[PDB]
Amino acid sequence: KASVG
Amino acid sequence: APESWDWSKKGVITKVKFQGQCGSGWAFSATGAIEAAHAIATGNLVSLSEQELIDCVDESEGCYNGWHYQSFEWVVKHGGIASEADYPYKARDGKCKANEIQDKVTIDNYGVQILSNESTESEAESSLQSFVLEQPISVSIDAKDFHFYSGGIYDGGNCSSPYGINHFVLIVGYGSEDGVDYWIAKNSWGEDWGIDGYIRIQRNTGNLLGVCGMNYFASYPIIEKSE
Ligand SMILES: *[C@@H]1O[C@H](CO)[C@@H](O[C@@H]2O[C@H](CO)[C@@H](O)[C@H](O)[C@H]2NC(C)=O)[C@H](O[C@@H]2O[C@@H](C)[C@@H](O)[C@@H](O)[C@@H]2O)[C@H]1NC(C)=O
Numbered sequence A: 001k002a003s004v005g
Numbered sequence B: 001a002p003e004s005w006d007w008s009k010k011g012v013i014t015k016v017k018f019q020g021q022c023g024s025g026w027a028f029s030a031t032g033a034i035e036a037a038h039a040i041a042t043g044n045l046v047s048l049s050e051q052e053l054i055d056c057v058d059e060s061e062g063c064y065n066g067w068h069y070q071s072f073e074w075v076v077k078h079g080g081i082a083s084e085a086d087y088p089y090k091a092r093d094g095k096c097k098a099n100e101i102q103d104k105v106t107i108d109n110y111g112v113q114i115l116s117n118e119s120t121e122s123e124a125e126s127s128l129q130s131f132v133l134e135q136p137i138s139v140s141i142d143a144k145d146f147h148f149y150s151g152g153i154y155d156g157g158n159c160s161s162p163y164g165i166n167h168f169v170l171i172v173g174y175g176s177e178d179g180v181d182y183w184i185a186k187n188s189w190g191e192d193w194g195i196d197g198y199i200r201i202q203r204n205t206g207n208l209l210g211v212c213g214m215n216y217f218a219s220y221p222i223i224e225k226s227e
Helices: B025-042 B050-056 B068-077 B121-134
Strands: B109-114 B137-141 B167-177 B180-186 B198-202 B217-222
Touching (some): B068 B217, B121 B167, B121 B217
Antiparallel strands (some): B109 B217, B137 B217, B180 B198
């Protein structure tokens, strides 16, 4: 769910 | 109140970090906020542990996602947070070793501001600016365009209601350029990303929730200045 590099 | 302000110039902000392949923007915004509040209050800037939060904040979900305010609460509850040095980043969920940490930076409390539809954009902008002047704050945001960003003032691009909360950034200040107001936000995708690891987010765009919903949920650590 959370964005990653 | 200044026309512009930037904490990253006042020596209260650590270098831009890299979260790697882990959804921990929440933790980096939290450590980032704690590092600033502590440098402002005590005069010492030290890098803090994002990993301890990823491993110990049981309300959040580690590398999947988490919350800034839950991080602050955990720190209040556990006597503080370990330094980056004593509890290194691995970009992956691990066992909480908080009990094994001997040194910690402490905070006095923490605040949260969840915008309601009873407030107007002007008031959301006004209070946020007020909080930032006192100390950098963490905000939830929809980072759908971040992989595309490289510079200039970001106006929201492809973001659209309902805004998703998939990332957090650290608002450290604000400024202007040709009559365009922006927030100076510290990101955690390495110094090569954006403007040396920072992104300028346009403000006063008209939407109560702000660019990509950044006006929605603000949270920051509270520390009384040292005597
Ligand atoms: C909104 O979504 C658009 C499409 O998903 C983005 O454009 C795409 O940007 C990619 C990387 O910058 C590029 O490889 C794609 O070819 C391009 N798609 C098309 C059809 O143009 C758009 O990004 C902005 O606009 C593009 C044209 C570039 O100038 C980017 O540098 C811009 O950031 C997204 N809007 C954003 C991120 O503001």
